[PDB]
């Protein structure tokens, strides 16, 4: 018979949503099984829904969205066999048995849930899109017959990728955050264009060598050392190899279509192989063992560059990079920043923890909105100990004005431009600090540092 809306849909937030779908005024208004069969789609995301009790009566649903709610039970879906697309990411679903017979599904999105058992998916052979990442899946057996899949993601405990053998239609695969070391099966997925394998245990990438249609590859956070196989993948435009143990970059030298290359957190001391990758706009080389960055002078299209946490003394090869917008090189050994002076398109400069004493070359970088210059530190060349040592202050702000020491060791004092100590007896060093707020464009920072003066006996 004609029931009230809120006795079908027992969940308060869904009752209220269905009221609006059905063109009614209150959630107590009654509706017929005919008013219900009018409803073929339902966008009910982020509405705080806890239960979909009532949805079984919307027999003609072809497409639903219940993402970003608090669903646990999805039994109401069991017999809505006209469903072709389900979006239900970001809930608390564990049991997906109710999906087992919805064989007309072409799209199923379930990432960010609590699913372990995916056996109920095994007969959904019309799926071309299946998203299962950020779940607790360890066994992907049930996938072996879903041969029409073009996009697939899953996590987060899979070791055995063999069930993927016949999924040869796959173009996009995300196996991020699993426990995979053996990727032999991926040799069979020759139509892959995008492979995301962040955060696994992969050391042998030989299987990828014939995946020549890959344009996007991430092996971020794996166990890579030898990357020789990547030389085959000449269609790559986007490559992430960050957080591995890579030192030899020769295999990348011919990958001239690369516009993005992430190599941070590796064992790299020679970037000569990168010299010909002139299409690069983003290059990340933080957390390596770099000193010589001369090959970077050829990469004229670079807009973003990271070099932080390296052993770099001379930054000057960057002077030709006129399109640079972001440059992070904190924690290096740079003293002279005169090579940065004509990089006027920089809006973000992060140069703390260097050996910078003179900011005057930064004065015309007026598109800066973010700036970091703290915690500089250097050691002067030793001078011979005597009771009265004085050294010049060389610390200059963006104006060219000397910055007066903030602290001076061993009771010393300052009379511009000189710092003077009176030392009773031998000490093997003196020091001073400086600390001054500075603004360049609209970016504000503390320019601070410690200068050490060794004293020889």
């Amino acid at each position, epitope marked *: 018979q004609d029931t009230p809306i809120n006795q079908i849909f027992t969940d308060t937030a869904l009752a209220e949503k269905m009221k609006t779908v059905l063109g009614k005024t209150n959630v107590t208004d009654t509706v017929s099984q005919t008013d219900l069969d009018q409803v073929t789609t339902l966008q009910a995301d982020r509405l705080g829904i806890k239960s979909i009790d009532g949805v079984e009566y919307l027999n003609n649903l072809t497409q639903i969205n219940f993402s970003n709610n608090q669903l646990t039970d999805i039994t109401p879906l069991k017999n809505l066999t006209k469903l072709v697309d389900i979006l239900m990411n970001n809930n608390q679903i564990a049991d997906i048995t109710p999906l087992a017979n919805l064989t007309n599904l072409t799209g199923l999105t379930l990432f960010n849930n609590q699913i372990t058992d995916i056996d109920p998916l095994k007969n959904l052979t019309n799926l071309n899109r299946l998203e299962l990442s950020s779940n607790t899946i360890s066994d992907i057996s049930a996938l072996s017959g879903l041969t029409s899949l073009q996009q697939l993601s899953f996590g987060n405990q899979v070791t055995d990728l063999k069930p993927l053998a016949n999924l040869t239609t796959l173009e996009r695969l995300d196996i991020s955050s699993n426990k995979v070391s053996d990727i032999s099966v991926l040799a069979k997925l020759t139509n892959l264009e995008s492979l995301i394998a962040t955060n696994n245990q992969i050391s042998d990438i030989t299987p990828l060598g014939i995946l020549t249609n890959l344009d996007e590859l991430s092996l971020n956070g794996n166990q890579l050392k030898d990357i020789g196989t990547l030389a085959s993948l000449t269609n790559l435009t986007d490559l992430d190899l960050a*957080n591995n143990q890579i030192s030899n970059l020769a295999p990348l030298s011919g990958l001239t279509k690369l516009t993005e290359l992430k190599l941070g957190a590796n064992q790299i001391s020679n970037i000569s192989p990168l010299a010909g990758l002139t299409a690069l706009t983003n290059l990340e080389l*933080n957390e390596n063992q770099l000193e010589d960055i001369s090959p970077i002078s050829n990469l004229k299209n670079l807009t973003y560059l*990271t070099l*932080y946490f390296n052993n770099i003394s001379d930054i000057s090869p960057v002077s030709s990079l006129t399109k640079l917008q972001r440059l992070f090189f904190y*924690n290096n050994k740079v003293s002279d920043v005169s090579s940065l002076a004509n990089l006027t398109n920089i809006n973000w400069l992060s140069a703390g923890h260097n050996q910078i004493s003179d900011l005057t070359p930064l004065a015309n970088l007026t598109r800066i909105t973010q700036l970091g210059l703290n915690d500089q530190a250097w050691t002067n060349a030793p001078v011979n100990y005597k009771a009265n040592v004085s050294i010049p202050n060389t610390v200059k702000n963006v104006t060219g004005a000397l910055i007066a020491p903030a602290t001076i060791s061993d009771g010393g004092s300052y009379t511009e431009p000189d710092i003077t100590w009176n030392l009773p007896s031998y000490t093997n060093e003196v020091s001073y600090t400086f600390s001054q707020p500075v603004t360049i464009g609209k970016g504000t920072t503390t320019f601070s540092g410690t200068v050490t003066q060794p004293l020889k006996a």
Partner: nanobody
Framework: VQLVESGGGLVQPGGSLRLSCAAS????????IGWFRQAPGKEREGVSV??????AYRNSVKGRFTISRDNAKNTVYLQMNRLKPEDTAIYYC??????????????????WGQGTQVTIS
């Protein structure tokens, strides 16, 4: 990802203390590891960071503190010498994923431990 700080205590001005940041449930090789501290009514502030073998230190502790790792023990240490009253604080360790990019030495840290109280009389 679980971090545990220990080694805090009461110490005389000019004295020394060694903190340990013991990590369990993940390889420390995948993370940069940072020591932070927070004094009463102040912001939590970075003290030192190690990423692989490269280290960084806030100005006020340069020359006095040394961060180091024992990879065998999955532990990061902060050697604090010539301690001053200004170094009084609860000391915390945290990590950040070395596979990302960060705009500063101190940004992006998380998985904070319980902390260890350092008091200089």
């Amino acid at each position: 990802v679980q971090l545990v700080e220990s080694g805090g205590g009461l110490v005389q001005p000019g004295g020394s203390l060694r903190l340990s940041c013991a990590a369990s449930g993940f390889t420390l090789d995948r993370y940069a590891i940072g020591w932070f501290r927070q004094a009463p009514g102040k912001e939590r502030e970075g003290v030192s960071v190690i990423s692989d073998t490269i280290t960084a230190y806030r100005n006020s502790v340069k020359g006095r503190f040394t961060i180091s790792r024992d990879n065998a023990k999955n532990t990061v240490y902060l050697q604090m010498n010539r301690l001053k009253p200004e170094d009084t604080a609860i000391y915390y360790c945290a990590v950040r994923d070395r596979g990302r990019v960060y705009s500063s030495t101190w940004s992006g840290f998380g998985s904070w431990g319980q902390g260890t109280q350092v008091t200089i009389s």
